[PDB]
Amino acid sequence: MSPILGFWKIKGLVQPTRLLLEYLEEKYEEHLYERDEGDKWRNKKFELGLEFPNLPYYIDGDVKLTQSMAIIRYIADKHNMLGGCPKERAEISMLEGAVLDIRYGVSRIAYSKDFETLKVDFLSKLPEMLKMFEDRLCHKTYLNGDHVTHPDFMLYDALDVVLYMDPMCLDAFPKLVCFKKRIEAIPQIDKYLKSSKYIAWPLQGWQAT
Amino acid sequence: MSPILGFWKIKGLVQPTRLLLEYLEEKYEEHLYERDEGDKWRNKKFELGLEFPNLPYYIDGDVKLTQSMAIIRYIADKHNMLGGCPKERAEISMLEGAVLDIRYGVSRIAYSKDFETLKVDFLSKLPEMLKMFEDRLCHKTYLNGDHVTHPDFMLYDALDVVLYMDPMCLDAFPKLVCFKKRIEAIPQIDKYLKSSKYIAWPLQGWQAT
Numbered sequence: 383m384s385p386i387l388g389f390w391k392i393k394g395l396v397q398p399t400r401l402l403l404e405y406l407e408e409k410y411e412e413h414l415y416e417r418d419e420g421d422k423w424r425n426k427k428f429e430l431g432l433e434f435p436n437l438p439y440y441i442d443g444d445v446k447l448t449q450s451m452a453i454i455r456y457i458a459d460k461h462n463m464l465g466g467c468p469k470e471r472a473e474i475s476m477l478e479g480a481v482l483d484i485r486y487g488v489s490r491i492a493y494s495k496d497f498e499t500l501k502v503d504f505l506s507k508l509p510e511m512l513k514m515f516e517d518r519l520c521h522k523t524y525l526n527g528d529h530v531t532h533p534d535f536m537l538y539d540a541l542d543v544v545l546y547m548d549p550m551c552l553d554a555f556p557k558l559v560c561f562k563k564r565i566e567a568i569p570q571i572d573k574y575l576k577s578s579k580y581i582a583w584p585l586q587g588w589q590a591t
Numbered sequence: 592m593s594p595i596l597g598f599w600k601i602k603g604l605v606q607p608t609r610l611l612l613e614y615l616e617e618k619y620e621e622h623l624y625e626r627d628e629g630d631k632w633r634n635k636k637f638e639l640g641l642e643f644p645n646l647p648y649y650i651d652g653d654v655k656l657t658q659s660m661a662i663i664r665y666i667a668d669k670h671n672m673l674g675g676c677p678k679e680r681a682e683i684s685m686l687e688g689a690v691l692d693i694r695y696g697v698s699r700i701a702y703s704k705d706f707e708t709l710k711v712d713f714l715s716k717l718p719e720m721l722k723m724f725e726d727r728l729c730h731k732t733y734l735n736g737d738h739v740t741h742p743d744f745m746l747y748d749a750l751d752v753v754l755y756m757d758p759m760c761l762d763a764f765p766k767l768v769c770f771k772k773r774i775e776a777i778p779q780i781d782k783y784l785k786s787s788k789y790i791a792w793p794l795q796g797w798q799a800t
């Protein structure tokens with residue numbers, strides 16, 4: 383049976399899980415919901431068989447999941463990409479939590495009203511952050527070496543969002559600015575980004591500042 | 592040698608990790624900073640050997656980690672308590688994300704300003720969230736059934752800090768209210784709480800409204 387991921391019609395926390403699936407050339411079908419359809423959601427929210435009703439959600443035969451990460455860490459984990467050995471396993475978890483610090487650092491205020499004023503406070507911490515990746519991919523093709531892991535999209539995402547809040551901000555980081563290319567290079571992702579699927583704007587909710 | 596886990600002198604994201612440890616009777620020694628000691632932190636912040644400098648951190652021979660989860664998922668992992676199978680691995684990653692949804696619902700508000708302007712707006716959809724557990728802890732002893740996993744503790748604290756703001760809250764949720772006891776009903780855990788190692792408060796931090 384074909385798996386069923388589900389989430390609004392934005393990028394939010396699903397965007398990365400899309401590419402992880404896109405890059406694995408996996409077959410799956412999307413179940414979206416648009417800015418008003420909040421009803422049909424509040425409708426099936428408890429009709430699907432999810433222990434913890436929430437969006438996004440993933441359903442194949444075996445499981446019925448809800449919790450963005452537990453859903454990518456599954457798809458990935460299915461195809462041994464998680465690392466078979468504590469250290470290496472914690473090593474992605476460390477690359478996970480980080481990419482979501484740069485990723486949540488927008489989401490927070492992205493809603494928290496008066497954006498302009500706050501953005502800055504944040505944008506001046508983004509460097510101690512973005513930095514660490516410039517000096518990671520400094521002698522590594524992708525975050526975790528030779529092969530593509532799953533954080534290697536979570537970040538590609540974080541970036542893909544920031545060049546929208548201050549397009550320059552990457553520059554001092556060639557490795558990163560280049561990074562974003564090496565990814566969009568991966569044929570499978572190409573197929574996608576120039577597809578009819580690909581959901582362009584928005585990055586947050588149809589509310590967000 | 593003896594492992595080092597470091598954080599500020601509060602509970603924040605470490606509290607859980609400490610119990611996971613405490614529960615496993617594991618040996619480890621603390622390294623905590625106070626509300627003023629920010630310097631000494633900003634000091635060794637890059638002298639340790641951490642690929643991604645941040646608080647808290649965990650160091651023990653093989654790995655030097657940052658990222659709160661990556662840490663706990665490591666201690667745990669290192670004892671098999673993470674489930675050796677995809678489904679049962681994502682199951683715990685489902686619980687994880689959801690216990691954090693309660694804690695991350697009291698820390699972008701408590702960092703906002705006068706919390707009284709961003710309190711209940713979430714204390715709104717806190718129920719469905721709490722509820723979902725009331726219902727998971729229906730037939731099961733621990734969030735995962737027969738044996739203690741790591742999201743348990745997580746929860747245990749999530750809840751612990753929740754009583755704080757407005758005691759009553761856990762009422763229509765006796766399975767829960769009951770739960771907490773079942774936890775601090777574990778010998779080992781009981782051995783901490785009463786002791787001179789458990790940090791009283793602030794459970795949150797020193798910038799709590």
Ligand SMILES: CCCCCCCCSC[C@H](NC(=O)CC[C@H](N)C(=O)O)C(=O)NCC(=O)O
Pocket residue numbers: 394395435436437438448449450451489587688692695
């Ligand atoms: C944890 C705070 C983050 C808040 C911002 C979330 C932005 C994405 S839009 C989806 C939103 N819920 C979630 O994303 C669930 C959070 C969960 N942490 C996850 O990672 O999946 C919702 O309105 N779901 C429909 C509903 O159940 O009301």
